[PDB]
Amino acid sequence: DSETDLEALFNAVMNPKTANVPQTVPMRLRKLPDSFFKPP
Amino acid sequence: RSVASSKLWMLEFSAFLEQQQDPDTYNKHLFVHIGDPYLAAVDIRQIYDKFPEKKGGLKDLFERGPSNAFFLVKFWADLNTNIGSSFYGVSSQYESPENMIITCSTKVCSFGKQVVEKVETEYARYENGHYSYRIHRSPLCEYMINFIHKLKHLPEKYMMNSVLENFTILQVVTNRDTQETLLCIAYVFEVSASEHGAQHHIYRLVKE
Numbered sequence: 001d002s003e004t005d006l007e008a009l010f011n012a013v014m015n016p017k018t019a020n021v022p023q024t025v026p027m028r029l030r031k032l033p034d035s036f037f038k039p040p
Numbered sequence: 041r042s043v044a045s046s047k048l049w050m051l052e053f054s055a056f057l058e059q060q061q062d063p064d065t066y067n068k069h070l071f072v073h074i075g076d077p078y079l080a081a082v083d084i085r086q087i088y089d090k091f092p093e094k095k096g097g098l099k100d101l102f103e104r105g106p107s108n109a110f111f112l113v114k115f116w117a118d119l120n121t122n123i124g125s126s127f128y129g130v131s132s133q134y135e136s137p138e139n140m141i142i143t144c145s146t147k148v149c150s151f152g153k154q155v156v157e158k159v160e161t162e163y164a165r166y167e168n169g170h171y172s173y174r175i176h177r178s179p180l181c182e183y184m185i186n187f188i189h190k191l192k193h194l195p196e197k198y199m200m201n202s203v204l205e206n207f208t209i210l211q212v213v214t215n216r217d218t219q220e221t222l223l224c225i226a227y228v229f230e231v232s233a234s235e236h237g238a239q240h241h242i243y244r245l246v247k248e
């Protein structure tokens with residue numbers, strides 16, 4: 001496997017049943033300002 | 041002077057698609073653009089995993105300082121494009137009190153791992169009691185062009201944002217001779233949903 005694989009990155013989202021990428025904490029769930037998710 | 045340390049200020053930053061309609065006609069689409077305000081603070085520890093680690097990585101760079109050189113930019117990118125060949129470019133402008141030879145390094149990352157790096161060296165031009173540095177119409181690498189094309193061919197915007205969740209860019213501007221970090225900018229992306237176009241928030245990166 002390769003974390004920098006561009007096809008795998010897009011495949012993970014297009015075809016989630018075959019997703020093979022690192023699992024991460026979404027930005028939404030991190031300790032960040034509300035403005036981070038609310039555009040001006 | 042938002043994106044500015046004590047020694048360098050980035051006045052302008054833009055990524056664009058330029059299309060030639062006919063020999064005398066060009067259309068330019070801005071994907072993202074930046075052009076004494078108070079900038080909110082973000083704990084840099086919250087973003088370390090999204091950028092390269094080890095020596096020369098974000099943590100190492102931040103710890104070496106200066107702390108006032110470190111910024112996080114959140115873009116809402118405008119991906120609403122159209123269609124003579126086209127040109128994908130990046131332009132940016134800087135100002136300094138000092139006459140320096142500067143190096144601009146841009147790393148594009150996936151899951152915090154470097155995929156590509158672009159490196160440019162820039163010399164100073166004297167301007168109105170200061171020095172200006174300009175990177176004009178720097179060609180966007182093929183990886184980024186492919187990335188953009190793949191993004192647009194995703195069925196829904198929620199898919200675009202899902203991909204962007206793990207896509208980052210780290211910009212490091214350095215004094216070539218002294219290796220001092222003049223500016224370090226971390227870039228995070230979502231797609232713009234608004235009809236008003238591309239938008240951004242700029243944050244100061246802090247330790248604790």
Ligand SMILES: *C(=O)CCCCCCCCCCCCC
Nearest residue numbers: 055071117130146158180181184
């Ligand atoms: C290759 O040369 C890497 C250079 C990266 C320059 C950064 C350009 C920023 C691209 C923003 C486009 C938005 C896509 C979601």
